[PDB]
């Protein structure tokens, strides 16, 4: 189903500074995971000031079962 907030935030921590305005890789190898990006309109925000709810966009990724 939908990746949890816990999952997405864990993933944001794992990708650290590779987070960018481009969609990340899928967070998983099998099943459903998340991809994340810095919202286009937030590209000028210092990384340390990015807000999970308002500056990070999310999309589900569906890998093979």
């Amino acid at each position, epitope marked *: 189903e939908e990746p949890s907030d816990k999952h997405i935030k864990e993933y944001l921590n794992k990708i650290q500074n590779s987070l960018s*305005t481009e969609w990340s890789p899928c967070s998983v190898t099998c099943g459903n995971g998340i991809q994340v990006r810095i919202k*286009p*309109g937030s590209a000028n925000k210092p990384k340390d000031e990015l807000d999970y709810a308002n500056d990070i966009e999310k*999309k*589900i990724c569906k890998m093979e079962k």
Partner: antibody, heavy 132, light 113 residues
Framework: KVQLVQSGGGVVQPGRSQRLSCAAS????????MHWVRQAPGKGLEWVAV????????EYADSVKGRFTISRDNSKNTLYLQMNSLRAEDTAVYYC?????????????????????????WGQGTTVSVSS | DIVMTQSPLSLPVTPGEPASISCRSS???????????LDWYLQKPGQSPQLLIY???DRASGVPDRFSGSGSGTDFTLSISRVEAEDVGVYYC?????????FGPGTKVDIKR
């Protein structure tokens, strides 16, 4: 670059069929729900159909239901529109466009958060002219 | 189906002056998740449509600052702080709340001389 490359279309007689293609390059089609949108000559935009990233939950505008069907082949990074029983009303430029909301959350079922960020990538358009 | 209306339908803009386009929906586009499912697209002459604004107020990638979207529920506005020659074309709002997605009729912008 990131591109949707459309092909197909051209002149087709009323009642005949045409199949449109929309091939992605620079992006992975399986990461998108995909839409068709069309524009009759001199008129506005009209939404035609959508298909989720895994091919499920195909949906159609009332104006085409029963005659058009949407399909995709993620392994070929390509989206299709099959158009049967074409009418003069169907003459238009047809566009494909992307949607990050791969599985229809929020708009079709409950969601914990939004996944839609507009239809950001558009093909160059395919002209379909329905005429005898 | 949700019905979308726009005003004005024709919008000439003197160079240097701002412009504003109104969009109304027949049903609220505010979702329980807090987002307003309203997009704005521009179609320049002979070109495919391109995304300007999504979710009411978010700028798409590559969209200049002069474009901004505002509003909520059934009442939305596209504001263009200035209209360059490259901004001429037809502006459409579109609701993305539920299928069928539906578009406004279009507002045609040109340079006022």
């Amino acid at each position: 670059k990131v591109q949707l490359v459309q092909s197909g279309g051209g002149v087709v007689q009323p009642g005949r069929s045409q199949r449109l293609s929309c091939a992605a390059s620079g992006l992975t089609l399986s990461e998108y729900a995909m839409h068709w949108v069309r524009q009759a000559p001199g008129k506005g935009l009209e939404w035609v159909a959508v298909i989720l990233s895994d091919g499920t939950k195909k949906e159609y505008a009332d104006s085409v239901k029963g005659r058009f069907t949407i399909s995709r082949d993620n392994s070929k990074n390509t989206l299709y529109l099959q158009m049967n029983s074409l009418r003069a009303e169907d003459t238009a430029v047809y566009y494909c466009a992307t949607d990050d909301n791969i599985l229809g959350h929020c708009r079709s079922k409950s969601c914990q958060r939004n996944y839609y960020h507009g239809m950001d990538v558009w093909g160059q358009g395919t002209t379909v002219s329905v005429s005898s | 189906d949700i019905v979308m209306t726009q005003s004005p339908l024709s919008l000439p803009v003197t160079p240097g002056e701002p412009a504003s386009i109104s969009c109304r929906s027949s049903q609220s586009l505010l979702h329980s998740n807090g987002k307003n499912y309203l997009d704005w697209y521009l179609q320049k002459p002979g070109q495919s449509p391109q995304l300007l604004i999504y979710l009411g107020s978010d700028r798409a990638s590559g969209v200049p600052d002069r474009f901004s979207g505002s509003g909520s529920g059934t009442d939305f506005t596209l504001s263009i702080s200035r209209v360059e020659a490259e901004d001429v074309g037809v502006y459409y709002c579109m609701q993305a709340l539920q299928t069928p997605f539906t578009f406004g009729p279009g507002t045609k912008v040109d340079i006022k001389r």
